[PDB]
Specification:
part of a larger assembly, 2 chains, A: alpha+beta, two-stranded antiparallel sheet, 1 helix, B: 1 helix
């Protein structure tokens, strides 16, 4: 339930091939950027960084949970379906 | 006027269904129940 890892903007790159090492079976890679992950305060900062480095990019708008209406009293509604059968 | 005998002895003759039999007896005296409007919260 913690939301502290959703505060900042991230920039990662497209995933490329990983293959089994013939000797041990370890995951090999030839992608130098496979682990690169940058952090940004805003999406403008991330876009600015991508633009000056020549990377083409996709920006996905931040998804924020929409505010909910909570009411403990509704658990015992006289005539509504919100009444709970168990606690 | 007497104050030396116990006058609560009827319950020595109560049985398994005494309480529910009285509830059945009282059924004809009640006012009609209110209604939530639906058969149950799951309707």
């Amino acid at each position: 339930s913690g939301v502290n890892n959703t505060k900042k903007w991230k920039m990662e790159f497209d995933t490329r091939e990983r293959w089994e090492n013939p000797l041990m079976g370890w995951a090999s890679t030839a992608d130098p950027l496979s682990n690169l992950v940058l952090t940004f305060s805003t999406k403008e900062d991330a876009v600015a960084f991508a633009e000056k480095n020549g990377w083409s990019y996709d920006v996905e708008e931040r998804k924020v949970p929409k505010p909910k209406s909570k009411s403990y009293g509704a658990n015992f509604s006289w005539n509504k379906r919100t009444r709970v059968s168990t606690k | 006027f007497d104050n030396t005998t116990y006058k609560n002895l009827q319950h020595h003759d109560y049985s398994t269904y005494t309480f529910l039999d009285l509830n059945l007896d009282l059924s004809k005296f009640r006012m009609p129940q209110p209604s939530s409007g639906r058969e149950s919260p799951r309707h």
